[model samples]
Target chain A: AGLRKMAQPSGVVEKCIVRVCYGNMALNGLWLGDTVMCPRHVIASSTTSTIDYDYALSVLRLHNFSISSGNVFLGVVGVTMRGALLQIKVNQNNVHTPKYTYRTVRPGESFNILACYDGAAAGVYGVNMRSNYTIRGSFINGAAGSPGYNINNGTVEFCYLHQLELGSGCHVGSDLDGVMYGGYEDQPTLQVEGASSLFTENVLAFLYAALINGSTWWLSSSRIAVDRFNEWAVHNGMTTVVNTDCFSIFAAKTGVDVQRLLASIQSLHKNFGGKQILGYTSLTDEFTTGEVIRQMYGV
Target chain B: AGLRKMAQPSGVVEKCIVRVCYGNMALNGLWLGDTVMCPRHVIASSTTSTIDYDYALSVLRLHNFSISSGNVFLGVVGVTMRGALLQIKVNQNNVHTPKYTYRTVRPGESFNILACYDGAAAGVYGVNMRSNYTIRGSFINGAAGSPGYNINNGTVEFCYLHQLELSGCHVGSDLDGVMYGGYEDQPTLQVEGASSLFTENVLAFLYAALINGSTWWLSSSRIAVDRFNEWAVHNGMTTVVNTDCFSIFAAKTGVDVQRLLASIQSLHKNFGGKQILGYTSLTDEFTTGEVIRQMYGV
Candidate 1:
């Protein structure tokens, strides 16, 4: 009556199951098993957009062999994807934003694709995505003022920057582009005072176009200042200044003559528009341009 | 009986008949079956002494072959009796005297020998007759002062002298040598006045024994001389006079100044010492040793 059908319940179904297992296994102190599933999840979410499974495998392999236990495996992957809306959104939405993009370059890796895309939008993406960005030494553009790469608004101090390149507007500063706007525009000036950024042995290419774009303005300003000083000396009855060039104007005035001119210019400033005039006072008359002229002419 | 008697003449007659035939034939050319005997006296006189013949052979050999003849081939031969008095005299006189023994050296042949002896015992004879001599190159005793091997009293100009050595009083004027002596003593002085004999570079050595025999003087009476001028300037003074130590002394008076002193001393004479004192007028105050006490505080 208590379910004595086709199969009877043999004491609450106490049956032993036979199974043949192969592949990999793990061992405990006592029991032997065909499969040993880890209690923890081995997969990890990458900080970067791209996943470097090789890096992950390296970490895992090292952990598997190391004598020490209870050690956590860490992997870093760099990835950069452009023109992919889904990837961009996933990258932007990730809790851990990617610090860099990564790519693999094994031996016999050709750079033809990189060379074709250098200084272009695709080149930037490729370089950023590459695990070995320095494999291609420099990036350049045929365009007049296009930047090959830009690292904007960052402090690059004590960093070894080797083989960097720029088209026109590449910069590093507190602002958008430091080198492009270095004395450019009506923004807060990037004053590089003192000898902090000592440019030693750097072969600077001074293009004619660079001078055409506002570099002449600075040089003209220097010439104008010189002209003004010479004009002031001429107007103050200094014959030495009238004869000599602007470079020699300062040296042309004797100590007494320089004092007299300073006094005259001060009076003129006070009487006229109150504009300031500058003069040097420490030099002696023997060291003046007139003394040089006398010596040369045997006067 | 008559034919046989006619044919057989007397022995004296036969001898006379042979003599007449022999004398009539020419002796210059070969005579067939006509023998002419030279008398024993003629042969004796012809072979007596060959002094003229030996002399002639020597003169011929001297002019033959370009001065490189062998030594052993040039000798004489004579025959004398064993113990006779005349043989004794001949044997004694036949003692071989070498006349002008010379061995010529060809190009690339590095050595030769020459012996000169005195006293006419024919040519070079007797051992004690040899005097002080020299040997050079590969030879045993060569000439005292011959070029290419030895250097003595010879003018070798514009040639780089590699090495020079002296054993006994070798004088080298204007040449490189270990010990240099200039200005000839008791000969025609062949050096220019104020000119140095071993001028440019001389290096000497002194042994432990006394090196003093005569004074080695380097002198020019001129007030200003350029000899060792650089050394004088390095040592810091003008007049360096007869003091063995390397010290430079400033000229004491205007006459001792460089230019004026040079003029006075370089003159043929000192103008009989009249123009000597006035030579100081030619120089400026700076060069006249007048500025030394003021400028140098010396």
Candidate 2:
């Protein structure tokens, strides 16, 4: 009882809400103007007996539901545009926006929703398609109900969005703004205003993926090595780089003489099979510090 | 000269800047409107032969000067309030505000200035006292030029300010604001408006030290364990705690039975020598998830 009470979401005026348990019809807990809660863990034997909710309830409140593997959340009944689904998880389960009903409305009003996979055939479909849907971890693949991810609108923070498959890996809708630090993503399709944003050091490894829109960006470090930067200009449309000296940038190195330093740089250049003195070809206005070039591209 | 050209700060209209070498008077390179650039490394021998600059220069531009220790920057001559110092370092040096001149002016207009100590008796004095002064790392002890650090005014980011001494550590001025993520400070004095700001997970350790102003704050993570949080309220004037879920907060844990979980909690509680059930005494609204309590206080 104590543990159950602790898991309950605070600030609910009425107590004794319906609990969605395994082997129960999701509709039993789906009611208008009613609050539905699920246990922290629930595993199902078959799809028929799986935990499911109707996608057509209005002004409904769903809290703390974890749908385990071999299961599917077929649909959420009608969720009032202002209604919320808080602290929900779809662990290793495939959530489909049931063919009968084509959309999961207002899971965006939800907060702290997690969707991850442990095995194959587990991917997100048609869910997470609105605003205010905050705090989601990286998913294997994020696809829309139709062809593109225009409905996949929400801010993603502090999660690794790695798309092993060649699909949309956590698509950010145009409403999204900046993605804060301490999060990493590979091959992400960010759709922010002007397609520009501020990023820190963690985004360096995947600069190639974050090049959808070409505009001036505020970057962390002052010293940017010209190798990959020049490549992004030619392959992508990145034109200029600036020295903003933005985020907590620092470097520690003991000074070395020019003779030995040049020798060491040339040695590293040969080791990394570098083609040019700086990069394969340094463009005009392409500049970098000696140590920055050595550390960034070894050229 | 190719390497030397790369080290020079861009946007300087005058191309040729005098270099500060070992065994040269700091006054030789110190000139009004003439920028002084230091080599990346310099090792000096004695206090007198050390690279000493006049702390009282006007309209002076000093760029990328590193004062190696056994050294003291007795002072800058005079800096026009608008003059600047950029990309400087005082590696392992004892920088006194100089008993004669008594203050280091406009090191605050400086950006990317680093000061770290190798041995004892190394610390900061009346430096970093103005606006637009950005990006400083951790320091040992940060005392005032006179008695307190009203002069240590700047927005410190991405640096650990560990003051092991009993004095004020990284004193933030009234003009200062937030200390963003990826930086850690053991003990700090924040003097922002109303003494409140937003912080993330890296700040979980020193919650006790950051209790100067008693306003509400937005914190990362849904659940905060009741142990150290309750301690801050009693020792400091922290009146309330709220669930704001303001950052990238997440948790992963497998299911366990109630008996086993209770057994785990009690066992760990006894091991940590805990005094009360929920952290010496559980306050109302002092709520947390089972996993959060176990992970945070334990």
Candidate 3:
């Protein structure tokens, strides 16, 4: 009997009503002529302007509302309150530095605030919003953070941020450095050394080597020495190097070295008087010496 | 010079007369109407006859005389005179026993006589008359003396005489029997013989031993002993003995004699243990037993 009853539901069922108010409206103040409620368990979304904090409140009134034109100024202090599970979308196109604020909130009141940018703007500088003690009492500015302050735990991708500036700097364990701040140092006090730094374009620098205590520095000037050695080997008919830093022996070097070795071998043979070598010499001047050397060695 | 002059005759002339007579007639007196002298070394002929012997003497006055009509018969003792050489040709068919008388002959007198007959008639009797001769004397009753004869050396052939008879025969060496003749003797008589006298047929009979000695006595009655042995050998068969000089071996004697010889040879092979001889006996029958016997021992 318990198993049969556990297979289905039991008692008096109640429907949840989510009332979304536009333009800084509170869900508790929503009445019949003054409050609205949302249908049960449905998502309700709106831009707000008059909330004291970036807080979302749910009253029993079931209705949905929207703010199309004005800034969403929440009246809650020291907190940015949003809906517990609400979404707010923005479409801003002007070259504007947007400033967002939320009113102070009483301690122990929990809420959730979510802001979604449509990324329709051509030149948006940054997102500036107030942070205070409301639920977690903090905001995450990078990929590494708690669930309430994390930015990457949400489903947002494919947006470009050309330059980002974080207030109170960045914490190493609090954010994903390359993912959220694009290879920026979390502590701004560390000198941005070498051209390898994300902020610098030209300088020799060292990466943090996980296995070594002293940093190994690389110099960009050593490439000029490699270029000089390549020039010298090419003129001497020894090396055949390309601009891509790979090297090979030249095809002419094999003939040149063979000629020299043959000349030495012929000198040895003349001194030793083992046998005389014979063959016809080539007519062209480039191969004339090589041909004579070949004849000297009976090759 | 002597011989040359002798070769030509001396210059002298002589005259003679010749007379001819036909048939028998007596002599008349001679009348010498002309004197005709004879020529030297010449020949002539005439006839003479008379009624009496003395009258024939008177008729001698006629130097040339002739008589006809059978008057030439003179007595048998009348002629001691010489007569001219007379040549008489007789046609026997026209004459009956024509006779002639010869007188004493002179040195230069000669005669030639030729007797001719119808050759068709002479061939009917297988007799040929080639020349003429005459009897000298008359024939007595039926006997006649042996006449002298002469045959000139000439040829006479193809005379077919079934029976040849000769009586009172005498032969001299002068009468050479150049071709063929026969003689008979009553008793023993020696005859001359020569190689030419024997003909091819006589020689054939003589060589076959059918003729003996100087005579051949041929008779069909002699015993012809038909010996079986000789007959068997003649026909190439084995001989069989039998009784009687002329006995014929029974017809089966040929087969029986051959079978006996073959059996003897078969026994010989069996005794000798020769397989080849056995095989020969098995296949060969005794036909031509005489030939087989000739082949056997050889």
CA lDDT, candidate 1, residue A176: 14
Q: Give the range of the ten consecutive residues with the poorest summed lDDT in model 2 chain A.
A: A1-10
Q: What is the lDDT of every predicted structure here?
A: 0.18, 0.22, 0.19
Error of 3 at B15 (Å): 99
TM-score of chain A, model number 1 = 0.15
Steric clash count of candidate 1: 9
B145 Cα displacement, candidate 1 (Å) = 9.8
Model 3, residue A201: distance off in Å is 9.8
Per-residue lDDT of A1-299 in model 2, one digit per residue for the tens? 00000000110111111223333322112111222222111222233332222232322344323222223332333222211122233222222221111122232221111122221111111122222222122222221100111111121121111212112222332111112112222122332322222121212211211111111132222333445354444444233233323211222121222223212222332222212121111111111232122222222
Residue-by-residue lDDT tens digits, candidate 1, A1-299: 00000111111101100111112311110001221111011222342254443354345432232110112212212222211100001111222221221223221121111111111111111111111122222223211111121111221111111112222212211111112212222122332321111010000001111121212221211122224555564454322223324223332332122323333332332222211111111111112222222212212
Which candidate gets the maximum TM-score versus the true structure? 2
Docking outcome class, model 2: incorrect
- Fnat of each prediction, in sequence: 0.00, 0.00, 0.00
User: Which tens-of-lDDT digit does each residue in A1-299 have in candidate 3?
Assistant: 00000000000000011123443332211111112211111222342222222223444222344422123322211111122222332232222211212232221211121211111110001111111211111112211111111112222211111122233222211111112222333232332321111100000000111001121121111223334544443443222223321111211322122223222222322222221111001100111222222212212
Each model's total of backbone clashes: 9, 23, 50
The lDDT-based order of candidates, best leading, equals 2, 3, 1
Worst 10 residues of 1 chain A by lDDT: A1-10
Q: TM-score of chain B, per candidate?
A: 0.15, 0.23, 0.16
Among all windows of 10 consecutive residues in model 1 chain B, the one with the lowest summed lDDT is B1-10
